[PDB]
């Protein structure tokens, strides 16, 4: 089957994606890593930005990019920080 994942893009990622948010359908068990590969498949600028991003699942830091996505959830895309 499939699962519906909401993706929220931030900063450079949102600029490169051309959108702020996006709902995606992916095979159940798809890893965050695979998801990321998919997000940049048709957008070289986004793909490049994603190379340096970190990720949240329901605003919790993703420690394991191999973590399977089995339930609907929100993935936040976070470029390298640049405060101060």
């Amino acid at each position: 089957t499939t699962v519906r994942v909401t993706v929220r893009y931030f900063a450079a990622a949102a600029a490169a994606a051309g959108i702020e948010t996006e709902s995606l359908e992916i095979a159940t068990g798809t890893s965050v890593a695979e998801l990321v590969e998919r997000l940049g498949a048709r957008n070289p600028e986004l793909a490049r930005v994603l190379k340096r991003c970190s990720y949240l699942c329901d605003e919790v830091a993703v420690r394991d990019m191999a973590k399977p996505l089995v339930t609907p959830q929100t993935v936040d895309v976070l470029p390298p920080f640049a405060g101060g």
Binding site: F10, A11, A15, L78, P79, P80, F81, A82, G83
Partner: protein, 137 residues
């Protein structure tokens, strides 16, 4: 057992003066990180800071981490501005009050470093040649 007087991200201009007043100990050290008119060899016109929704909490967590590990420090306050900023505006302000100056200097310095490392905010610079850059993208 240092107090965290105030911690906030805000669009409103932030005052080092106000924050040094907040932490008022015998020694006060304040820091202001200010928007420069250049980035390397390029002239800067203006910038914007944007923040993740978790930014506020993260800044609270950092401040508490620094406060807990410190010694001889009485009061800490720190703020990061978000939104459009002009050259000369303070983007980051922190103040530390301690019983002695050494603890104030050393704690304020480490506090600023950890905030810069861990605060989920982003910087969008705009240059005089009409180009722009997302810093560290």
């Amino acid at each position: 057992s240092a107090e965290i007087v105030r911690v906030e991200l805000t669009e409103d201009p932030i005052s080092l003066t106000e924050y040094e007043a907040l932490v008022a100990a015998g020694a006060v050290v304040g820091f202001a990180g200010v928007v420069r008119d250049h980035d390397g060899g390029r002239s800067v016109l203006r910038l914007e800071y944007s923040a993740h929704p978790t930014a506020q909490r993260t800044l609270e967590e950092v401040a508490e981490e620094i406060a807990a590990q410190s010694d001889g420090v009485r009061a800490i306050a720190v703020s990061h501005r978000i939104g459009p900023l002009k050259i000369g505006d303070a983007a980051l302000v922190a103040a530390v009050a301690a019983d002695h100056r050494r603890a104030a200097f050393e704690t304020c310095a480490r506090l600023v470093d950890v905030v810069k490392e861990r605060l989920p905010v982003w910087k969008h610079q705009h240059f005089a040649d009409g180009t722009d850059e997302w810093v560290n993208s």
